[PDB]
Amino acid sequence: DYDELLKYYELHETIGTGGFAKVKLACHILTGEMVAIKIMDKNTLGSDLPRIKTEIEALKNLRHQHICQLYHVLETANKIFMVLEYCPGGELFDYIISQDRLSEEETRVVFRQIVSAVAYVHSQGYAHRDLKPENLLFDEYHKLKLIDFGLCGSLAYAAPELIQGKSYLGSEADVWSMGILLYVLMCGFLPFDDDTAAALVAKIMRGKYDVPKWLSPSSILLLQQMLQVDPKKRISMKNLLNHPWIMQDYNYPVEWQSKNPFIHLDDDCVTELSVHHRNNRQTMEDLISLWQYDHLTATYLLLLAKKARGKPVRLR
């Protein structure tokens, strides 16, 4: 149901096309800021409900320049709504196709942002496990924002040990997937590719792939370190962060650390919320610090975003 949602947001166009979920552009009424709202249906999710809720819980604990920001989770009889940072530049998927394949130096810029995000995810004790271009969006500055739940699918990005249901480390699976992404960025097609699941899986397990003539020797060496069938022989995140290839154009390791972590509440945002809700400062801070990802969380985070853009920290 939409009744509560529409008390806080005005719906604009559909932007995201899907199968179990729609995405809408919307305005957050109190702040006037634009958001994307992902609409998921509970019955259509079925027994993925728990797994989806677990991942939503994980997202509540991430805060990073290359990870899409969550503002609000609203649950009803049949729906879960996720109110998220609007990323107007569209999927990395469509960008790759539009350009055929990226230059080595553009792929380096973009790939460093992926590594930044994924390294941070790992540092917080999580692993993504479904990295692929459909799960990466560009903002209006053409910076990458990692998402999830995006639509043989992700089989082509899946690590061999993952594919065969055996024991694995999420971090190692993520490195394999980033290797597939690296290939695609530079080639415009997949390293392992086929008409059926059995054929595709067979190829993945063997680990052989073509090396186009335009790939540099250093690109070739990095690809082989990331696409090692045996997870133990795969490059670690530690060694990826300062890899020679990674630092070839910009001679500094990947800045993976969060650039705007939540430390203390922002006083200007608290002040404005206090005047608005007719609360004193202590009472308002106490409410905000519950971090329920309700409408109050959303309002706080969106005022914080306003301030970051130099706009008056003001509610309408």
Ligand SMILES: CCOc1cc(OCC#Cc2ccc3ccncc3c2)ccc1C[NH3+]
């Ligand atoms: C590390 C990221 O973790 C997660 C990200 C999630 O993102 C859900 C989403 C989205 C989305 C879809 C379409 C958009 C269109 C335009 N602008 C923004 C959009 C955002 C969900 C869960 C996790 C946790 N693994």
